[PDB]
């Protein structure tokens, strides 16, 4: 499957793509404002994620640091990124269909649209100014808006036992972005697409 990753932000981002125990395609790349990077994701990829990283430095070997979304200091991510990270999430070719969503469960750093480029389903978007409106206690000094689990480490915010409800913090993310997951047990906003669809992830779709 092809994923065209487009940076419409006015700032550089370092795109990342991983399924947690391996890179997808090269795993990461710099995208200056306006640049597009198309990756190939293997059919059947389960639990894949794409995100933006901000304020990164990498040496000539591809090792360094990012202020949001750092994946073990690598340009080419093999693992998932450090919150806060707005997440484009997908599982492909699962009994004949693809499944996509956006999640704020690991916080929000950069606005995003995640849409099919082929027929048969809608896209999803979380493009509100979550960082600007972020509750004081969730603001990440390194940049972005943390989820409450990251900040407070409670069973209720982290849904540790599989039982939890919405919270004042989850409701903030849900108010700003109704079409993204705001906590682990949120009413799902997953979209079912035809198996083997192709996609575009756009950072700052309205900004
Ligand atoms: O065991 C680990 O340290 C570990 C494992 C995974 N895994 C993620 C997946 C797939 O969802 N499998 N291991 C991710 C990370 C990380 O992002 O730091 N770390
Ligand atoms: O760099 C890692 O391998 C790593 C870093 C973190 N950390 C993330 C943060 C910030 O929220 N602090 N450590 C968690 C994990 C894991 O759970 O596997 N793994
Ligand atoms: O503590 C962790 O979360 C962690 C630790 C290691 N470590 C591996 C080694 C061996 O040299 N030491 N920490 C790898 C990872 C990961 O790849 O996600 N994660
Ligand atoms: Eu780890």
Swiss-Prot record:
Pfam families xrefs: Thaumatin (PF00314)
Family indicated by similarity: Belongs to the thaumatin family.
PROSITE patterns per UniProt: THAUMATIN_1, THAUMATIN_2
Cystine bridges: 9-204, 56-66, 71-77, 121-193, 126-177, 134-145, 149-158, 159-164
UniProt keyword annotations, A-Z: Cytoplasmic vesicle, Disulfide bond, Signal, Taste-modifying protein
Cellular localisation: Cytoplasmic vesicle
Function according to Swiss-Prot or TrEMBL: Taste-modifying protein; intensely sweet-tasting. It is 100000 times sweeter than sucrose on a molar basis.
Keyword Signal: yes
GO cellular component, one term: cytoplasmic vesicle
Name of the featured protein: Thaumatin I
Claim: Signal is one of the keywords in the record: yes
Species classification: Eukaryota, Viridiplantae, Streptophyta, Embryophyta, Tracheophyta
